[PDB]
Write a protein that binds this DNA or RNA. Structure first.
Lengths: 125, 125
DNA sequence: GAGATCGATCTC
DNA sequence: GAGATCGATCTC
DNA sequence: GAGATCGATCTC
């Protein structure tokens, strides 16, 4: 199943202050749940930087198919953002501080997609 | 300038969790410890590290933060949240919460830079 | 420096 | 009272 | 600054 995502599903996730990021739905380390109601949220683990995890509203998740989605996700986030300042922030290229990990994260997500759900759960959790 | 800095001890409220003892910390991926959600000046967030469960970290609105003095604050925080949650923490969550309180109590007796050095183990994993 | 925003101070 | 404006502040 | 608006008038 009734829920849109389950643990192991690969998803683009959007957090304010980050570019759209390749993630995997994962159990929260403390609560051990992967979804909760605040509107529904899912817990995710960022690829490319293991210590980074977050609760994300369904509205900021998109099923991951490939890097080719990224440009359109940026544009759609900017289209929905109210202020010129947020629009301009959303349209900036990924910063040098983040690019190495974002690239690694895309590579990991593509490798994860080639594995079974239980395999990628074991490797990345 | 800012209300909090890295190393400050704070109670943090996340929906689905009891009020939790935390330390303001640099985000693993952005390296920043504060930011404005959606770039709006009224929406300042701080990044926090949960005591008692190293892998658990989160961005919290300043308004969902209370400076940590001691465990005795917990009941009033519960009461205030119930006004706007009162059943006791149980089970495994209680044990992790109790361990986080003991750590926060130890950290509260230390200087800012002393506790930042002594609690770097919470940044692992 | 560049871009955007927020606000005390003008013209009307 | 309402724009217009010249910033001064904030992020980058 | 500049229209509506109130007071004591001019002048009819």
């Amino acid at each position: 199943h009734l829920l849109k995502y389950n643990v192991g599903d690969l998803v683009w996730s959007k957090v304010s202050g980050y570019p759209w990021w390749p993630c995997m739905v994962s159990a929260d380390p403390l609560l051990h749940s992967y979804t909760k109601l605040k509107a529904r949220q899912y817990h995710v683990q960022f690829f490319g930087d293991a210590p980074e995890r977050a609760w994300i509203f369904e509205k900021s998740l998109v099923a991951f198919e490939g890097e080719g989605q990224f440009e359109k996700l940026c544009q759609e986030s900017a289209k929905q953002a109210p202020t010129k300042a947020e629009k301009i922030k959303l349209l900036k290229p990924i910063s040098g501080k983040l690019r190495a990990q974002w690239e690694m994260g895309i590579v990991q997500a593509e490798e994860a997609a080639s594995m079974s759900v239980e395999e990628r759960k074991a490797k990345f959790t």
